[PDB]
């Protein structure tokens, strides 16, 4: 017993779930970009931390 | 000797706070992810109910086991 109402409404349910997965994709895309921004910031911080050291000590830490 | 001048110290302080700003954005985004997942769970149970509801009760009961 699937009337026209139930069929239309099932169609609308699928569409609502797609809007939500589209939001999940946008969020995860942004999360990956913000992680990359953190990686880039960290590279700068790390450089600054090495820069204040005596070179033989810096050398020793780099491995 | 080491050479951490006042400039280097101040800048390192600025590096740390720039990084906290980024981790705060990461926490916000992850919060929104979990909120969006919860809305999807809520929507999925409505869809699920609709799909059971159109079946003969016996069939739905049988699938529910």
Numbering used by the authors:
A (entry chain B): 346 to 408
B (entry chain A): 344 to 408
From the paper:
The soluble guanylyl cyclase (sGC) is a heterodimeric enzyme that, upon activation by nitric oxide, stimulates the production of the second messenger cGMP. Each sGC subunit harbor four domains three of which are used for heterodimerization: H-NOXA/H-NOBA domain, coiled-coil domain (CC), and catalytic guanylyl cyclase domain. Dimerization within sGC is mediated by at least three inter-domain interactions involving the GC, H-NOXA/H-NOBA, and CC subdomains.
Crystals were initially obtained of the wt sequence but the SAD phasing required the introduction of an additional Met residue via the I371 M mutation. The I371 M mutation that was generated for SeMet phasing is not involved in the dimer or tetramer interface. There are 8 CC molecules in the asymmetric unit and each monomer contains a long amphipathic a helix aA with 13 helical turns followed by a turn and a short helix aB. The turn is initiated by a conserved proline residue, P399. Four sGC CC monomers come close together to form an apparent four-helix bundle in an anti-parallel arrangement with two of such tetramers in the asymmetric unit. The CC monomers A and B (and the equivalent CD, EF, and GH) form an anti-parallel CC dimer. The CC dimer interface is formed predominantly via the a-d pattern residues and the a-d assignment, as obtained from SOCKET, is indicated in Figure 1B.
